[PDB]
Amino acid sequence: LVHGGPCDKTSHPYQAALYTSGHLLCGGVLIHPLWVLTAAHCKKPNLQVFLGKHNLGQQESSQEQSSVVRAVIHPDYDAASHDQDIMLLRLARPAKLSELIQPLPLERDCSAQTTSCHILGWGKTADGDFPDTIQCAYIHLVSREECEHAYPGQITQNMLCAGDEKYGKDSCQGDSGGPLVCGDHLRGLVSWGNIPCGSKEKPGVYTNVCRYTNWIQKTIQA
Numbered sequence: 001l002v003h004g005g006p007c008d009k010t011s012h013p014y015q016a017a018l019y020t021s022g023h024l025l026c027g028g029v030l031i032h033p034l035w036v037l038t039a040a041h042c043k044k045p046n047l048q049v050f051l052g053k054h055n056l057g058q059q060e061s062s063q064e065q066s067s068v069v070r071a072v073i074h075p076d077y078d079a080a081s082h083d084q085d086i087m088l089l090r091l092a093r094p095a096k097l098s099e100l101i102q103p104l105p106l107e108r109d110c111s112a113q114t115t116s117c118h119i120l121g122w123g124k125t126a127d128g129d130f131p132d133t134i135q136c137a138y139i140h141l142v143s144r145e146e147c148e149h150a151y152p153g154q155i156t157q158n159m160l161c162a163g164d165e166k167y168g169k170d171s172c173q174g175d176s177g178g179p180l181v182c183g184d185h186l187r188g189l190v191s192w193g194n195i196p197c198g199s200k201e202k203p204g205v206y207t208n209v210c211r212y213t214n215w216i217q218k219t220i221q222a
């Protein structure tokens with residue numbers, strides 16, 4: 001995450017860190033004690049999920065680790081266009097809820113009224129390094145018309161755009177699958193955006209979570 005700052009220690013109990021062969025790979029969102037939501041492009045071998053983390057470089061008494069027993073990529077995910085970039089991960093070991101491990105409720109209304117939005121992750125910072133402490137930034141939803149002009153023919157109804165006109169606060173490599181939180185509900189998942197990261201003109205592009213209510217419910221209930 002570029003141009004942000006360290007998150008408050010208690011503000012992100014729904015944040016997951018995803019690892020593959022020891023590499024920090026992606027972020028994720030705890031939505032149910034058995035399920036973590038992330039981007040379909042985070043599909044990698046033997047995924048390991050860490051909940052209750054704040055600083056990746058130190059062992060924390062609140063952390064909980066789990067392997068993934070099932071990975072469910074949306075049937076219509078298109079890797080070339082990033083369309084429908086969503087995947088459900090079933091945990092081997094259900095989350096032991098605490099003050100620092102809690103699920104985040106989903107935004108179900110695609111016409112939801114404007115609320116305060118934020119993004120978070122352990123992705124690449126402004127200097128180009130990967131931070132130990134999770135970064136946070138306030139950002140705002142960008143109109144569909146402005147986003148379409150920023151990325152002609154690339155923005156679908158399954159994508160939302162968000163950014164910051166002042167500093168260009170943006171998600172980046174490694175933040176993938178992390179949450180775009182608006183009014184204490186999950187509004188989007190980190191999917192793609194500009195290179196280099198920075199949202200002053202070309203906003204970050206997020207999976208539009210409100211479009212996946214039925215698919216998420218049907219996956220968790222089957």
Ligand SMILES: N=C(N)c1ccc(NCc2ncc(-c3ccccc3)[nH]2)cc1OCc1cccnc1
Nearest residue numbers: 041079171172173176191192193194195197204205
């Ligand atoms: N600027 C952003 N808001 C932004 C946020 C997250 C990501 N994640 C990386 C990522 N998304 C999708 C793929 C992918 C999909 C299919 C196949 C292989 C790869 N990889 C990228 C972002 O912007 C582009 C970007 C790329 C690389 C380095 N820096 C910025």
